Scaffold this motif. Structure first.
Motif, PDB file in Angstrom:
ATOM      1  N   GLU A  45      50.639  41.498  24.598  1.00 41.19           N
ATOM      2  CA  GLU A  45      49.307  40.936  24.392  1.00 41.19           C
ATOM      3  C   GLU A  45      48.755  41.511  23.100  1.00 41.19           C
ATOM      4  O   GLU A  45      48.665  42.731  22.961  1.00 41.19           O
ATOM      5  N   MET A  94      47.246  33.697  30.768  1.00 43.25           N
ATOM      6  CA  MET A  94      46.918  33.458  29.376  1.00 43.25           C
ATOM      7  C   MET A  94      48.023  32.797  28.584  1.00 43.25           C
ATOM      8  O   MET A  94      47.756  31.847  27.848  1.00 43.25           O
ATOM      9  N   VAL A  95      49.248  33.284  28.699  1.00 48.86           N
ATOM     10  CA  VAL A  95      50.290  32.875  27.773  1.00 48.86           C
ATOM     11  C   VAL A  95      51.171  31.820  28.437  1.00 48.86           C
ATOM     12  O   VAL A  95      51.959  32.128  29.341  1.00 48.86           O
ATOM     13  N   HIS A 101      50.876  34.682  22.044  1.00 49.89           N
ATOM     14  CA  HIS A 101      49.969  35.709  22.552  1.00 49.89           C
ATOM     15  C   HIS A 101      49.140  36.205  21.375  1.00 49.89           C
ATOM     16  O   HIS A 101      49.463  37.209  20.740  1.00 49.89           O
ATOM     17  N   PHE A 141      44.801  36.380  20.470  1.00 49.36           N
ATOM     18  CA  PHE A 141      43.541  36.213  21.161  1.00 49.36           C
ATOM     19  C   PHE A 141      42.399  36.432  20.182  1.00 49.36           C
ATOM     20  O   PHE A 141      42.595  36.952  19.085  1.00 49.36           O
ATOM     21  N   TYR A 176      41.198  24.982  22.811  1.00 48.80           N
ATOM     22  CA  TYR A 176      41.447  26.189  23.596  1.00 48.80           C
ATOM     23  C   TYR A 176      42.603  25.985  24.554  1.00 48.80           C
ATOM     24  O   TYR A 176      42.612  25.030  25.328  1.00 48.80           O
ATOM     25  N   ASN A 181      41.876  32.235  23.904  1.00 47.49           N
ATOM     26  CA  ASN A 181      43.084  31.801  23.226  1.00 47.49           C
ATOM     27  C   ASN A 181      42.835  30.403  22.691  1.00 47.49           C
ATOM     28  O   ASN A 181      42.135  29.604  23.319  1.00 47.49           O
ATOM     29  N   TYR A 237      52.273  26.210  17.592  1.00 39.23           N
ATOM     30  CA  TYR A 237      50.869  25.964  17.866  1.00 39.23           C
ATOM     31  C   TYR A 237      50.431  24.561  17.484  1.00 39.23           C
ATOM     32  O   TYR A 237      49.497  24.036  18.094  1.00 39.23           O
TER      33      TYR A 237
END
Ligand SMILES: Nc1nc2c(ncn2[C@@H]2O[C@H](COP(=O)(O)OP(=O)(O)OP(=O)(O)O)[C@@H](O)[C@H]2O)c(=O)[nH]1
Ligand SMILES: Nc1nc2c(ncn2[C@@H]2O[C@H](COP(=O)(O)OP(=O)(O)OP(=O)(O)O)[C@@H](O)[C@H]2O)c(=O)[nH]1
Ligand SMILES: Nc1nc2c(ncn2[C@@H]2O[C@H](COP(=O)(O)OP(=O)(O)O)[C@@H](O)[C@H]2O)c(=O)[nH]1
Ligand SMILES: Nc1nc2c(ncn2[C@@H]2O[C@H](COP(=O)(O)OP(=O)(O)O)[C@@H](O)[C@H]2O)c(=O)[nH]1
Ligand SMILES: [Mg+2]
Ligand SMILES: [Mg+2]
Lengths: 426, 427, 429, 428
Positions: D198, D257-258, D264, D266, D310, D370, D422
């Motif tokens: 993280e 989260m991931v 990862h 944030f 997001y 994220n 991404y």
């Protein structure tokens, strides 16, 4: 109990952000530090029209204000009631138009219109009770009339739900406060056409024709004018904050007042206008004051009466009052003077009743003169933009801030639609 | 012991409600926490909780009632206000509520009706003024018709006084207010407020009257209308013998009513009263409840309720003499067709009422054809207006179209055909 | 005598175990240090001290620790509060494969300590939630070990259901389908009580704004007394655990009734209301006053099981249920003629101090199985299908033992159960 | 009980640790001389998480502090606190890294590593069970970036199951300090996307903009900015330290989260940050003002949601709060704004509530987000790595230090693989 956010813009806009916020801050008992001072407990429950809780019970208004330069927002801050506004929502301008219209419209206020919509979505988020933003501007200004129009633009194009009560000061053309004020007037009377819902005409001579002719004041002030520019005339908004017999609210009010969705013009009188030498000889009752409104001396707007048709009438009254002589003396002057009154309107009023009288007034009959017949003073303005159109007074200034000649010729063929909408009743 | 539920809507309705529930709670021993016959049920603790369909939209409607004296008398879940407002017209009041305030209370009407013993009727107070008194009745009345059956729903009304009329703009509301009373019809009184103001001027010695005095009088109206199910039974009649018996067809259900209680303590406690003098004062033209002269029409069938110290001898003697009286222009098809119903409580007043302590009252209730002048006046004003397309936008935005006012116009023209066909002779 | 044992798992078990063993001590005369001045649930010592039969198993040590230092230090025997070292971290996979199997043998050694004392045992009550890891991972591993080691006993279990709209985690649909499928074959009768619908009753009925974590537990904690007021007191028709176990579930792939408690009124709203035995049977089948967001107006009532408490009379009970079945404002079944189950008991509910449920002489617990629970799964069929379309979050689960086919072989079992709610909902010729 | 071992790295690493070990030493109530001082027993019961009991009832922290120049390391010994650190846990080089990543990864700093990892086992063998380590550093210079990657990839082998956090300080263009800044932080993301569970992104440009426009200070020096902003987000782990109603520690929050094991990154933030003056006028309810943060004036990193979507959002709260108004305020924020969220997840928010606020505050909250808008930072630091490497601008302090020219073309494509992953979930 239904929310209003008192919108206001300009050097008038942050000064009319003094005297509206005197009478409201007197009505609900606002201390200079915020915490409560009023006595009766009906004043505390309805108070969340405007203010907002904090820690320790502090109330702070939610109001969007726009000013021109940082030198005029501060002269009302160092006053009796400037300590009460939290100062995030005073937005500021490095450069103003100096009696023009569009400097802060396209390019200088393009960052200011992108920050107040980080603000109206920051304090008109919680509109669970809100019926309308009372929105006012000043149209000689550049940040109060460019951003104030871009408050009209990027809100009222999204959400059409709002009542639009303008104390927006149109400078009158007999003795105008500037020679160049017609140019940003003809975009503004046009900007009063498209969206406005309940709307006065403030011509500043008609406030200047009050203190001498009626109230007997030798040396007035704008801050003495400003009790009448807004502060008495926000006795339209009283039924949402105080109850009555026939209770109202502005969204509720907004659906009786709009026959044809454009025409928007009044001629009111907050019927208490007597001097202190003429306070000895007046009985304060709901008959007598409205019967004093009917003259040729008591108007906040435009027109001398007998100069047109009465296409609608409105009313808001005060106090625990008499239900019969409201309706005995309204029709006793409706159908006696049958020459002035138009033939095809029976029942156009909305008699609303407000329990709490305005403070210090025994009985305060209030009345508003609705109309559409203000065009004995609104063809004189529209024949004095065309002087600067043909000879091009400042277009060499105008076209340089991302402007063409098609924007101000739209407001030649589309300001005239409102002249073309009394076309049916001449 | 016969049971009912009452409705007070709008300012006229809720100050009539101040009055009407004040007189219910004084003619029974109802004190503001519950423990000291015909409108409630009790609890485990055992205490008067008035059954109640009410409907109100505003911010601050009956919060003055909630702050008022009788604050724990009314249990609060049964009294209805929302979070949003219906802006006032017939249109907006009809069409932004039909998902909001009447449809979660169609589940609430569960508790307020079942445990009443004789489920006999509802009493609805409405005013022809605006989009709460008149326009919120319509949604309600189609709920009552589509779920109730053949129960009576008695409409008490203000008529818009034939020269002065003030609320949110009246005629476009009024045309579908009576196109609403087309749908559900039992019996619908009106009052002209101006005749009240002038009988307040002259019979009562009230100079500068006020807002209070009307609604106590409408309370005495609903008292002697539907307390026959409440007090003792000598010849015990109900609203089932009122709605069946006044008006035959669902076309004309518009009576008028001048009481023995229209006369004040300061003035007409002096006057001697007897049944004949009271019924004479009833059938006199000046004192009428809507300002229509009764001589300019045909008396259709007078259906009487009785209070006071009446006697079956003298009430029938006055009935017979009135039926003989021909300046009272009677209808052609039958002089008969009445109803009478009996109670025995003499008038000793509520606080805030200006009437007397006499031993007697008589409740005139009469149907006449003599109000078609005022109905043609109102229809004259509506078709004077609408042809210039005035006040279009905020009636047509939410559901009340241009062709719908015109179909309402032709429906009401057929109803004036019904006026003349009922009034005029036939072979 | 007849006796049973409570089991709690995770945060959602301990925080309602500490709120339902609150009610038991105030029902009887037990002061919180134990020595009273009921022998189904409690247990005598030789000195008059009383110890309840309850295990509070969990993994993260900071939720069990309020029991060890709060008001109730000396009540629970300290070998019955079982704690781990690190939490399950919102994985079905961690709480079923990697971190759970160290504690499978300690708790299954402590359960025999309570049940050796038991003369003839009836039930093991489970209080698990479908959201987190040790409430769905270790619960599933527990119920396939209870059936193996304890044969055929009744096992009752509860839920804190993943709501349709609001949710407190992102990995909720992965856990909830993975926990139903492996306990579809071992559990006897599960209670679905959604966490969202208890919020809205606290707005409309019992008007407490901002309801905290305690005020959901006291409302759930009154159900557990009403279901088990027949194992503690005497009644006209006492209904034991096995007694309504068979009157509720028609097919062994269908065991998910709902729960409804009829009087929830504020003490300002207990002035003005009858609480009559016919009036608080109307309020159980109202769609607003249920306790899972699924309205049975779209559903056929497969069965009902009603339980009554307080000052009731068995004449007006049967008068009301006749008046229920006749009307079509409220809807019913098409092929089940009897349809009902009625229970009566004497002692009215006792209000714990600080509560908000006002003291009511006549209380009703309601249990029913509907065909309208399919819409809470055809919702959940697709919400897991959003997740598993692009293999979101699968790398966390696969690293501790599961093949990726066990996402599909638990999907297809769950995707065939929707027909099992459609083949019985269809009429018969 | 669930131990954390703190690591620091660089001059930025030791002005975060000297301000992080101040905030937490106020929570547990510890004097600068190291004894116990508070009032409630709830403080001391979970002191065996970040601390260690010494003789006489003292309490020392478990922090391994590094740098390559001793000039930084003396200044921690004479501070407001800093006498509570054990003097054995200070390690430092003799000659500096030269503000050079290659010097601090291969030749100048690799002599130090076998002393730094050797303290780390001593603070690991005294444990019960570690959640995992925690490294605070900066992506600017060689003692924080090159050591920071060499520390992480030497730990993640030998202690793999225990999680790792890091608190990066990514560079910014409009506030830039070193010419070598895009030449380091492009080459060290490659060694950071492999071995970290993280990571955060806390850049100095955003912490200036929230310091002149939210807090409205006059002179934001580095002590008055690191403490009130970035040494208090590291107190998000009060779940792991204090009991709460619905709690979620440092490991439970990584799994929500991931959604793919290489994304990862944030963007944190702290919710009450009003001013010295506007603290008087606001309301400490659970509002939506800083709680609809989309107008991103109070975001602790550069990029913001308006440009992207997001993926998953956190919110860790602290206070005596109600768990209805947590949840309906996750309903004014997912529907009044609608298209900035990922389509294929309908409940993106993981929440938690604990019961001890910070000192002087009724109410507090922490936001961890994220986003797919974080790829605009990673393009933009690779625009100033492609430009400088085209003409071979500052190359020869890297080729002579054991690093060849092949290791730059790996850390440009792999730097642009993260732009590729991404951008897939940008709208989809
Ligand atoms: N009988 C009686 N009528 C009243 C009284 N006060 C006002 N009214 C009348 O009520 C009529 C309108 O009905 P309201 O109840 O006031 O108005 P509404 O539409 O129901 O409510 P709003 O939408 O707020 O106007 C008006 O014409 C008034 O003359 C009163 O005290 N007694
Ligand atoms: N707000 C609130 N939530 C509760 C309460 N009791 C149970 N929950 C629910 O508990 C569920 C998840 O429980 P967790 O905290 O994750 O505990 P768990 O399910 O055993 O999983 P772990 O965290 O690993 O222990 C959520 O759905 C919460 O809503 C309560 O009293 N208040
Ligand atoms: N009627 C009225 N006019 C005002 C007030 N305050 C300012 N003004 C008017 O505002 C006009 C100029 O203000 P503005 O256009 O905003 O400032 P400018 O850019 O310097 O011209 C003048 O006509 C003033 O009369 C007020 O309180 N009442
Ligand atoms: N947060 C924070 N950042 C700093 C501080 N001082 C410097 N920085 C920034 O963080 C980086 C620190 O460089 P650093 O690696 O410690 O220098 P080196 O140790 O000699 O390699 C630089 O890019 C600075 O812009 C500080 O006190 N706090
Ligand atoms: Mg009203
Ligand atoms: Mg846990």
């Amino acid at each position: 109990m239904r929310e209003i956010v008192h919108l206001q813009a300009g050097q008038c806009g942050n000064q009319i952000g003094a005297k509206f916020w005197e009478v409201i801050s007197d009505e609900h008992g606002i201390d200079p530090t915020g915490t409560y001072h009023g006595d009766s407990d009906l004043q505390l429950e309805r108070i969340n029209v405007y203010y907002n809780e904090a820690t320790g019970g502090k109330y702070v208004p939610r109001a969007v204000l726009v000013d021109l330069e940082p030198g005029t927002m501060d002269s009302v801050r160092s006053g009796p009631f400037g300590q009460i506004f939290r100062p995030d929502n005073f937005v500021f301008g490095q450069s103003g138009a100096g009696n023009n219209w569009a400097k802060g419209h396209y390019t200088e206020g393009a960052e200011l219109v992108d920050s107040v919509l980080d603000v109206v979505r920051k304090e008109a988020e919680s509109c669970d009770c809100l019926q309308g933003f009372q929105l006012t501007h000043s149209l000689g200004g550049g940040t109060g009339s460019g951003m104030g129009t871009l408050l009209i633009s990027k809100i009222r194009e999204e959400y059409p739900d709002r009542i639009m009560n303008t104390f927006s000061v149109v400078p009158s053309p007999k003795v105008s406060d500037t020679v160049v004020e017609p140019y940003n007037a003809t975009l503004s009377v046009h900007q009063l056409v498209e969206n406005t819902d309940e709307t006065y005409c403030i011509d500043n001579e008609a406030l200047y024709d009050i203190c001498f002719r009626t109230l007997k004041l030798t040396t007035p002030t704008y801050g003495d004018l400003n009790h009448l520019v807004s502060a008495t005339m926000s006795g339209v908004t009283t039924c949402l904050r105080f109850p009555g017999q026939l209770n109202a609210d502005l969204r509720k009010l907004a659906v009786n007042m709009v026959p044809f969705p454009r025409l928007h013009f009044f001629m009111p009188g907050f019927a208490p206008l007597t001097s202190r030498g003429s306070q000895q000889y007046r009985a304060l009752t709901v008959p007598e004051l409205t019967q004093q409104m009917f003259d040729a001396k008591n108007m906040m707007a435009a027109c001398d009466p007998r100069h047109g048709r009465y296409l609608t009438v409105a009313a808001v009254f005060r106090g625990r009052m008499s239900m019969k002589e409201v309706d005995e003396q309204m029709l006793n002057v409706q159908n006696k003077n049958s020459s002035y009154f138009v033939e095809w309107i029976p029942n156009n009023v909305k008699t609303a009743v407000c329990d709490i009288p305005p403070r210090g007034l025994k009985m305060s009959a209030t009345f508003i003169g609705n109309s559409t017949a203000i065009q004995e003073l609104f063809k004189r303005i529209s024949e004095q933009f065309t002087a600067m159109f043909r000879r091009k007074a400042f277009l060499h200034w105008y076209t340089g801030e991302g402007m063409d000649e098609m924007e101000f010729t739209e407001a030649e063929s589309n300001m005239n639609d409102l002249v073309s909408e009394y076309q049916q009743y001449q | 012991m016969r049971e009912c539920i009452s409705v007070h809507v709008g300012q006229a309705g809720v100050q009539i409600g101040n009055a009407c529930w004040e007189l219910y709670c004084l003619e029974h021993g109802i004190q503001p926490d519950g423990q000291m016959n015909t409108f409630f049920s009790e609890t485990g603790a055992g205490k008067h909780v008035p059954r109640a369909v009410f409907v109100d939209l505003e911010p601050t409607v009956i919060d003055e009632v909630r702050t008022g004296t009788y604050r724990q008398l009314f249990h609060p879940e049964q009294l209805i206000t929302g979070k949003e407002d219906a802006a006032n017209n017939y249109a907006r009041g009809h069409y932004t509520i039909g998902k909001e305030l009447i449809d979660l209370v169609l589940d609430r009407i569960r508790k307020l009706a079942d445990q009443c013993t004789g489920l006999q009727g509802f009493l609805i107070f409405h005013s022809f003024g605006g989009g709460t008194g008149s326009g919120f009745t319509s949604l309600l009345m189609e709920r009552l018709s589509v779920d109730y059956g053949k129960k009576s729903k008695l409409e008490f009304s203000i008529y818009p006084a034939p020269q002065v009329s003030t609320a949110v703009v009246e005629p476009y509301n009024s045309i579908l207010t009576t196109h609403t009373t087309l749908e559900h019809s039992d019996c619908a009184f009106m009052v002209d407020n101006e005749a009240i103001y002038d009988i307040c001027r002259r019979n009562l010695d009230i100079e500068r009257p006020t807002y209070t005095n009307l609604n106590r009088l409408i309370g005495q109206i609903v008292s002697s209308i539907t307390a026959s199910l409440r007090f003792d039974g000598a010849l015990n009649v109900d609203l089932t013998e009122f709605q069946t018996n006044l008006v035959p067809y669902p076309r004309i259900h518009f009576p008028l009513a001048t009481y023995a209680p229209v006369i004040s303590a300061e003035k007409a406690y002096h006057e001697q009263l007897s049944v004949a003098e009271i019924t004479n004062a009833c059938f006199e033209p000046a004192n009428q409840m809507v300002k229509c002269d009764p001589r300019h029409g045909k008396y259709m069938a007078c259906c009487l309720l009785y209070r006071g110290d009446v006697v079956p001898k003298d009430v029938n003697a006055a009935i017979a003499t009135i039926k003989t009286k021909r300046t009272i222009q009677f209808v052609d098809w039958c002089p008969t067709g009445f109803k009478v119903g009996i109670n025995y409580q003499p008038p000793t007043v509520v606080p805030g009422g200006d009437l007397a302590k006499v031993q007697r009252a008589v409740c005139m209730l009469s149907n006449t054809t003599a109000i078609a002048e005022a109905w043609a006046r109102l229809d004259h004003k509506f078709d004077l207006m609408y042809a210039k397309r005035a006040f279009v936008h905020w009636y047509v935005g939410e559901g009340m179209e241009e062709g719908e006012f015109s179909e309402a116009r032709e429906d009401m023209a057929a109803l004036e055909k019904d006026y003349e066909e009922v009034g005029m002779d036939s072979v």
